[PDB]
């Protein structure tokens, strides 16, 4: 018979949230691979592409450019990176020279007028040019002859011929402040969330507060720095976060030779969390509550004790602490015994231990000289 | 996944703590549970002339003495829980209203068999009888010992109310919990070597097989500091559990009774003392008589009369 | 010349919001009661960082140069008449420089009190504009500076020039303070607890009471 | 109280042995495995945490019975207070000598403890009764010299 703190448990998140600002200031793409022209091969221009959200799910998912291909990146995951610092080299030339746009290459662009680094990692980009770059008398910009090295002669380009002599509008972006967008998600309230805010990840019951943040200031703290709070980073508003629902989970039992009917008592839990009784110790399941009072056999807690009893039935009550007893004091009234009682009463103390010893070299290391 | 590998460290310090717990609950009853009825006070007080209103509980109220609340007034979440006192305070409030209408109407006979009544000033010839002081100096003296008592429990209000530092020993007792809770909280953001406290970062930062070794850096120190506050907290219970053994060994000799000890009923020859619950504590108002006037007298060790020596017989 | 850092360059150590409480810190802070370099109106180095502290009735100091040569070899960091230019950049200054009578940005009776902080790769600054009149030196108060900016620029910034009648530097040092935040989570008092035995007292108890 | 102090030294001792199954992160528990599993210059550092393992299960073993052992000369010392008190003589410490006036007790050995049979005297039939602080006889007060 008694009480057995036999598990914890913990409310597991329903959800994950994630929460970031508003995705202001994109860099310039438009700039450089919408750009109504390019320049020379022998002469390849760059611009920068850095302290921006570089946006390049947009260019992952394009069919504009041929290919969107990477000498030492993914260009789904590119979205979720941050390179260095990043520059947008852009040129105009025939098409057969677009296989000339990647590391540890040969021929009059790739090792003679746009070539690039063997250790480069860059994303490399062409738009087809016969309806926006090549012209019936000639592309004449098209001007040919170190990495980035920006004697030579026009390529033959032109918008009525194949695609090897057709021109493209070709770019690439290099590989701190190169930075893809953050992904935001929607808010949850008065549930056990996972959660991320701008850079702080937890776990809680996130609340609406009444704390007033200053206006620079994203994060609360309580005395003994649990962090207490978080401010949203699109609507300016303040919450609480409360660790998610946890406790002891305590079972009650008269002894099994006696029963095998249990009542299980989950320590400082609110019942709806979870016959069910709420006390201040926690929430009972599985007793029932009862108005009279009895001496304490197994204790809960918070006044609260329980018992088997009558068909038969775990109960919970409020502990009687014994009979109470109004003595009849006056001024002038004394109880005098008569006869008496000589009660032999054992008392039991502990006086020694098992006196024991240990060879500690046998127990760390018994029987090896190399641990030894 | 780790912290299993490290095979009985998470049970044996719950069980330890439990062994707290369960100790508490003990301590509690071994003071204050020492008496197997709940005795209610007259509703007349006719303790000749003897002013209790300040030390018997407050029926407009919980319900407890005038000097409790004073002292309930002067002393001030993720994975540590505090279990509640198997005992509320308004249930440690009956306790010590019961101990003290016994003591009052009915003297030490509580203590030993069944509450008797006797008149409060009648019980207080007996506690001078058990002094060595003859009662006749109570009765002869009744209203001014009154006075002096009424008096000597309004200086009490006064010392716990005015003064600040009045009850050092459970202030310091909380502080010292509180601080160990406290310490326990901020070691769980120290590095202990690892590449951060935030454990879930490591796991973000790093490979499984190269962050394992980050985390079992966290985990060993933790776990270091865990049973460090375990230790301290078994070593600290242990003295808690000497005090509350001397408090029942008081309650005992003390509230049940007269301690003839010398200087451990308190500075004086004991007369009877009375009890107050507090936070996490208990408080006793020892009464004791103190002589106060001395005359210095010429002496003789036993007297002649006819050649024959005669002795003082009790004096 | 000289004057008295009476109490002056406590900032917000960090984006947290925390009330009632007495959190202690270690950062670059201006050291409590130090001297000042007084200016009334000049090269000056920037040893780790500065507290600054400019009274006019018409804010004429107006730009700072930060960097390494001053000149073509780089924060040029610039308030005008509705806007905050800053930019980096390899330019120059003349023998005596005045104004006329890679990024941007957008913003006596007042003292535009400032902290300017290289760490981390990282540039910061924080301000406060001062309601009270004292036409001697910075007053014998209490105020603590809100942030204001951040970049990363990479630049090992060793020196400053500041372009308009007085200013005043003070540069910061490595301690520990002790800050007493309120209820609305405002820093209301400091202890710098190397100044005397009385703040090593302080910053042992965290309590500015000791008792 | 005996049978608790017993189980505590079983409980004690069992955990101790089970920790030489447990890993401490080791690649066996099975010292004898990373002896011969695993080159000595490899090995070492495994039998480095296994040792650092034991050690710490070792020093807390040690602890519990320390703290264990002050507790039980605690009670040694208040037991021997009891039998230089209560079984030599006959303590008025009230409640000292179990429940009522106390008259003698008798000690009885245990197994790693001690049992007393307090022999108490305690009231049993009252009477409640008229009663008079003091009695007047020729306006000059008595007073009862006992009782």
Same mark, same amino acid.
Request: charged letters at 15%.
């Given at each position: 018979?008694?009480?057995?703190?036999?598990?914890?448990?913990?409310?597991?998140?329903?959800?994950?949230?994630?929460?970031?600002?508003?995705?202001?200031?994109?860099?310039?793409?438009?700039?450089?691979?919408?750009?109504?022209?390019?320049?020379?091969?022998?002469?390849?221009?760059?611009?920068?592409?850095?302290?921006?959200?570089?946006?390049?799910?947009?260019?992952?998912?394009?069919?504009?450019?041929?290919?969107?291909?990477?000498?030492?990146?993914?260009?789904?995951?590119?979205?979720?990176?941050?390179?260095?610092?990043?520059?947008?080299?852009?040129?105009?030339?025939?098409?057969?020279?677009?296989?000339?746009?990647?590391?540890?290459?040969?021929?009059?662009?790739?090792?003679?007028?746009?070539?690039?680094?063997?250790?480069?990692?860059?994303?490399?980009?062409?738009?087809?040019?016969?309806?926006?770059?090549?012209?019936?008398?000639?592309?004449?910009?098209?001007?040919?002859?170190?990495?980035?090295?920006?004697?030579?002669?026009?390529?033959?380009?032109?918008?009525?011929?194949?695609?090897?002599?057709?021109?493209?509008?070709?770019?690439?972006?290099?590989?701190?402040?190169?930075?893809?967008?953050?992904?935001?998600?929607?808010?949850?309230?008065?549930?056990?969330?996972?959660?991320?805010?701008?850079?702080?990840?937890?776990?809680?019951?996130?609340?609406?507060?009444?704390?007033?943040?200053?206006?620079?200031?994203?994060?609360?703290?309580?005395?003994?720095?649990?962090?207490?709070?978080?401010?949203?980073?699109?609507?300016?508003?303040?919450?609480?976060?409360?660790?998610?629902?946890?406790?002891?989970?305590?079972?009650?039992?008269?002894?099994?030779?006696?029963?095998?009917?249990?009542?299980?008592?989950?320590?400082?839990?609110?019942?709806?969390?979870?016959?069910?009784?709420?006390?201040?110790?926690?929430?009972?399941?599985?007793?029932?509550?009862?108005?009279?009072?009895?001496?304490?056999?197994?204790?809960?807690?918070?006044?609260?004790?329980?018992?088997?009893?009558?068909?038969?039935?775990?109960?919970?009550?409020?502990?009687?602490?014994?009979?109470?007893?109004?003595?009849?004091?006056?001024?002038?009234?004394?109880?005098?015994?008569?006869?008496?009682?000589?009660?032999?009463?054992?008392?039991?103390?502990?006086?020694?231990?098992?006196?024991?010893?240990?060879?500690?070299?046998?127990?760390?290391?018994?029987?090896?000289?190399?641990?030894? | 996944?780790?912290?299993?590998?490290?095979?009985?460290?998470?049970?044996?310090?719950?069980?330890?703590?439990?062994?707290?717990?369960?100790?508490?609950?003990?301590?509690?009853?071994?003071?204050?549970?020492?008496?197997?009825?709940?005795?209610?006070?007259?509703?007349?007080?006719?303790?000749?002339?003897?002013?209790?209103?300040?030390?018997?509980?407050?029926?407009?109220?919980?319900?407890?003495?005038?000097?409790?609340?004073?002292?309930?007034?002067? $002393?001030?979440?993720?994975?540590?829980?505090?279990?509640?006192?198997?005992?509320?305070?308004?249930?440690?409030?009956?306790?010590?209203?019961?101990?003290?209408?016994?003591?009052?109407?009915?003297?030490?006979?509580?203590?030993?068999?069944?509450?008797?009544?006797?008149?409060?000033?009648?019980?207080?010839?007996?506690? %001078?009888?058990?002094?060595? $002081?003859?009662?006749?100096?109570?009765?002869?003296?009744?209203?001014?010992?009154?006075?002096?008592?009424?008096?000597?429990?309004?200086?009490?209000?006064?010392?716990?109310?005015?003064?600040?530092?009045?009850?050092?020993?459970?202030?310091? $007792?909380?502080?010292?919990?509180?601080?160990?809770?406290?310490?326990?909280?901020?070691?769980?953001?120290?590095? %202990?070597?690892?590449?951060?406290?935030?454990?879930?970062?490591?796991?973000?930062?790093?490979?499984?097989?190269?962050?394992? $070794?980050?985390?079992?850096?966290?985990?060993?120190?933790?776990?270091?500091?865990?049973?460090?506050?375990?230790?301290?907290?078994?070593?600290?219970?242990?003295?808690?559990?000497?005090?509350?053994?001397?408090?029942?060994?008081?309650?005992?000799?003390?509230?049940?009774?007269?301690?003839?000890?010398?200087?451990?009923?308190?500075?004086?020859?004991?007369?009877?003392?009375?009890?107050?619950?507090?936070?996490?504590?208990?408080? %006793?108002?020892?009464?004791?008589?103190?002589?106060?006037?001395?005359?210095?007298?010429?002496?003789?060790?036993?007297?002649?009369?006819?050649?024959?020596?005669?002795?003082?017989?009790?004096? | 010349?000289?004057?008295?850092?009476?109490?002056?360059?406590?900032?917000?150590?960090?984006?947290?919001?925390?009330?009632?409480?007495?959190?202690?810190?270690?950062?670059?802070?201006?050291? &409590?009661?130090?001297?000042?370099?007084?200016?009334?109106?000049?090269?000056?180095?920037?040893?780790?960082?500065?507290?600054?502290?400019?009274?006019?009735?018409?804010?004429?100091?107006?730009?700072?140069?930060?960097?390494?040569?001053?000149?073509?070899?780089?924060?040029?960091?610039?308030?005008?008449?509705?806007?905050?230019?800053?930019?980096?950049?390899?330019?120059?200054?003349?023998?005596?420089?005045?104004?006329?009578?890679?990024?941007?940005?957008?913003?006596?009776?007042?003292?535009?009190?400032?902290?300017?902080?290289?760490?981390?790769?990282?540039?910061?600054?924080?301000?406060?504009?001062?309601?009270?009149?004292?036409?001697?030196?910075?007053?014998?108060?209490?105020?603590?500076?809100?942030?204001?900016?951040?970049?990363?620029?990479?630049?090992?910034?060793?020196? &400053?020039?500041?372009?308009?009648?007085?200013?005043?530097?003070?540069?910061?040092?490595?301690?520990? &303070?002790?800050?007493?935040?309120?209820?609305?989570?405002?820093?209301?008092?400091?202890?710098?607890?190397?100044?005397?035995?009385?703040?090593?007292?302080?910053?042992?108890?965290?309590?500015?009471?000791?008792?």
């Amino acid at each position: 018979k008694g009480i057995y703190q036999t598990s914890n448990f913990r409310v597991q998140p329903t959800e994950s949230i994630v929460r970031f600002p508003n995705i202001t200031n994109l860099c310039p793409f438009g700039e450089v691979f919408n750009a109504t022209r390019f320049a020379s091969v022998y002469a390849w221009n760059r611009k920068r592409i850095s302290n921006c959200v570089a946006d390049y799910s947009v260019l992952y998912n394009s069919a504009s450019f041929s290919t969107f291909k990477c000498y030492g990146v993914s260009p789904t995951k590119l979205n979720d990176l941050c390179f260095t610092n990043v520059y947008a080299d852009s040129f105009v030339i025939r098409g057969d020279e677009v296989r000339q746009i990647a590391p540890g290459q040969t021929g009059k662009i790739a090792d003679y007028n746009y070539k690039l680094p063997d250790d480069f990692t860059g994303c490399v980009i062409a738009w087809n040019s016969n309806n926006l770059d090549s012209k019936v008398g000639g592309n004449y910009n098209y001007l040919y002859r170190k990495p980035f090295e920006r004697p030579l002669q026009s390529y033959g380009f032109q918008p009525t011929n194949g695609v090897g002599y057709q021109p493209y509008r070709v770019v690439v972006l290099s590989f701190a402040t190169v930075c893809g967008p953050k992904k935001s998600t929607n808010l949850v309230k008065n549930k056990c969330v996972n959660f991320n805010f701008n850079g702080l990840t937890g776990t809680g019951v996130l609340t609406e507060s009444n704390k007033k943040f200053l206006p620079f200031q994203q994060f609360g703290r309580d005395i003994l720095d649990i962090t207490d709070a978080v401010r949203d980073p699109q609507t300016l508003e303040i919450l609480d976060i409360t660790p998610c629902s946890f406790g002891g989970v305590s079972v009650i039992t008269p002894g099994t030779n006696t029963s095998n009917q249990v009542a299980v008592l989950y320590q400082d839990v609110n019942c709806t969390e979870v016959n069910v009784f709420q006390t201040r110790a926690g929430c009972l399941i599985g007793a029932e509550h009862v108005n009279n009072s009895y001496e304490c056999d197994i204790p809960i807690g918070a006044g609260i004790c329980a018992s088997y009893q009558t068909s038969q039935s775990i109960i919970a009550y409020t502990m009687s602490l014994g009979a109470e007893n109004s003595v009849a004091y006056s001024n002038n009234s004394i109880a005098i015994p008569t006869n008496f009682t000589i009660s032999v009463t054992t008392e039991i103390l502990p006086v020694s231990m098992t006196k024991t010893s240990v060879d500690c070299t046998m127990y760390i290391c018994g029987d090896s000289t190399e641990c030894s | 996944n780790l912290l299993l590998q490290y095979g009985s460290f998470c049970t044996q310090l719950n069980r330890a703590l439990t062994g707290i717990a369960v100790e508490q609950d003990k301590n509690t009853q071994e003071v204050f549970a020492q008496v197997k009825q709940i005795y209610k006070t007259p509703p007349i007080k006719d303790f000749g002339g003897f002013n209790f209103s300040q030390i018997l509980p407050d029926p407009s109220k919980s319900k407890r003495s005038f000097i409790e609340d004073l002292l309930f007034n002067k $002393v001030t979440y993720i994975g540590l829980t505090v279990l509640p006192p198997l005992l509320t305070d308004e249930m440690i409030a009956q306790y010590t209203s019961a101990l003290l209408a016994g003591t009052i109407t009915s003297g030490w006979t509580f203590g030993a068999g069944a509450a008797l009544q006797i008149p409060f000033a009648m019980q207080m010839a007996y506690r %001078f009888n058990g002094i060595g $002081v003859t009662q006749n100096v109570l009765y002869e003296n009744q209203k001014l010992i009154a006075n002096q008592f009424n008096s000597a429990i309004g200086k009490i209000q006064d010392s716990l109310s005015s003064t600040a530092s009045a009850l050092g020993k459970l202030q310091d $007792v909380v502080n010292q919990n509180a601080q160990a809770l406290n310490t326990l909280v901020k070691q769980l953001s120290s590095n %202990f070597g690892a590449i951060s406290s935030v454990l879930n970062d490591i796991l973000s930062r790093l490979d499984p097989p190269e962050a394992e $070794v980050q985390i079992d850096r966290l985990i060993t120190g933790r776990l270091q500091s865990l049973q460090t506050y375990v230790t301290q907290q078994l070593i600290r219970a242990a003295e808690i559990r000497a005090s509350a053994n001397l408090a029942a060994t008081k309650m005992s000799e003390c509230v049940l009774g007269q301690s003839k000890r010398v200087d451990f009923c308190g500075k004086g020859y004991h007369l009877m003392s009375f009890p107050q619950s507090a936070p996490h504590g208990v408080v %006793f108002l020892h009464v004791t008589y103190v002589p106060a006037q001395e005359k210095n007298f010429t002496t003789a060790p036993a007297i002649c009369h006819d050649g024959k020596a005669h002795f003082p017989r009790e004096g | 010349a000289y004057t008295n850092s009476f109490t002056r360059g406590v900032y917000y150590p960090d984006k947290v919001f925390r009330s009632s409480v007495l959190h202690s810190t270690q950062d670059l802070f201006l050291p &409590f009661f130090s001297n000042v370099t007084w200016f009334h109106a000049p090269v000056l180095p920037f040893n780790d960082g500065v507290y600054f502290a400019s009274t006019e009735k018409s804010n004429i100091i107006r730009g700072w140069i930060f960097g390494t040569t001053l000149d073509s070899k780089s924060l040029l960091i610039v308030n005008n008449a509705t806007n905050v230019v800053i930019k980096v950049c390899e330019f120059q200054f003349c023998n005596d420089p005045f104004l006329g009578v890679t990024f941007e940005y957008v913003s006596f009776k007042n003292l535009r009190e400032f902290v300017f902080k290289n760490i981390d790769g990282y540039f910061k600054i924080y301000s406060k504009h001062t309601p009270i009149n004292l036409v001697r030196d910075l007053p014998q108060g209490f105020s603590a500076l809100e942030p204001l900016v951040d970049l990363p620029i990479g630049i090992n910034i060793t020196r &400053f020039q500041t372009l308009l009648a007085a200013y005043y530097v003070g540069y910061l040092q490595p301690r520990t &303070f002790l800050l007493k935040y309120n209820e609305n989570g405002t820093i209301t008092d400091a202890v710098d607890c190397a100044l005397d035995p009385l703040s090593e007292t302080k910053c042992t108890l965290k309590s500015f009471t000791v008792e």
